[PDB]
Amino acid sequence: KEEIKRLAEELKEKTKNEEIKRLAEEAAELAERSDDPEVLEVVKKALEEALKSKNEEKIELLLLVAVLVAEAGSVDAVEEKLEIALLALKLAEESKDPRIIRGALRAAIAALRSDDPLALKTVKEALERARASKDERLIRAILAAAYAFALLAVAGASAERLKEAEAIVKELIAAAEKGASPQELVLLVIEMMVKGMGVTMETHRSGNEVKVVIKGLHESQQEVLLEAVLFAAELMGVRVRIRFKGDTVTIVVRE
Amino acid sequence: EAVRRRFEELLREALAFRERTGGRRETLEHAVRLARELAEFAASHPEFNRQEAVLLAIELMVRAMGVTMETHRSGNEVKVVIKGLNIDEQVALYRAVRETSKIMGVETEIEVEGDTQTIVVRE
């Protein structure tokens, strides 16, 4: 059938990104090899969407959709992965809050880049519950905890530690729907990263601010905590003050 | 002084990559590689001071991202206050400061709050 390559090559010259240039070629190579009428329909569609978008995340998540469909050969094998992006991409057209659009896309991309079944399972469930509610503070809270739980799977936590973190994701959504403050919703993401990475913490509640002390984090792990705490704190509108010193991370959470 | 000529060369490569890609995350992960590529060149120069080597890694990332900085020197402590960073830039800045300091072998006390990241370089 062809006609896919020229759509994928036009994205390569249009974009300035390097990952877009690499995945677009990778999609044109893998789709040419597959012969499924359902797959060449998705790949062709995903490319036409990326050509219209000015968003490097929207283009990246659409490309990573055509790649993971053509490389899988069939559409039934990536039926969940497809809905994970299809929900996150849906959650971008409707919502107008830049926090939600950037959050929902990075959360899907991190989950699709990971392979953990418990990670993709948690993300689809989280995006179903986010797309349902019309509450903005809940959608911004589900995405904070989802993207933080995806970065644990990208960093490669153990099977029994992601389990502990998954229960925390479940407690965060439950507390967000019951109306917990954005401060405590941040402290549940810190606890997810603490439990997720197998450390402990102390909680000082003095006045209107919370102090958390974490010890035993390798520099590769402090980078994941900082990214997860800064991103979730931005989705809640909450001031954080993180101070590093060796293996000790100190977090000061203000509203 | 040959470390300085390697610095100026990596700085052209850092500013040029800021124009070509213009992506809020591809330039960062690239520029961090350049900051560590500078730390590697100065790690095998026993003449070069280990603090000033990290400072040039910091100054390399500051211009790669487009923010400003102020150098406060107090004996053996050099405090660098960097202002105007978002989330992607601070995660990219902290990675570059963690690895270049690990390579030079200096302790760094980094404090992040809002859009400002404060780095202390002892030895």
Numbering used by the authors:
A (entry chain A): 3 to 257
B (entry chain B): 2 to 124
Paper passage:
We set out to design protein systems that undergo facilitated dissociation. We use a switchable target binder (host) and a flexible effector that can rapidly bind to and switch the target–host complex to induce a large steric clash with the target, forming a strained excited ternary complex. We show here that by explicitly considering excited intermediate states when designing coupled protein systems, a broad range of facilitated dissociation systems can be designed.
We used X-ray crystallography to structurally characterize multiple states of our designed systems. For (1), the target dissociates 20-fold faster from AS1 than from an unhindered binder fusion, probably because of minor strain in the target–AS1 complex.
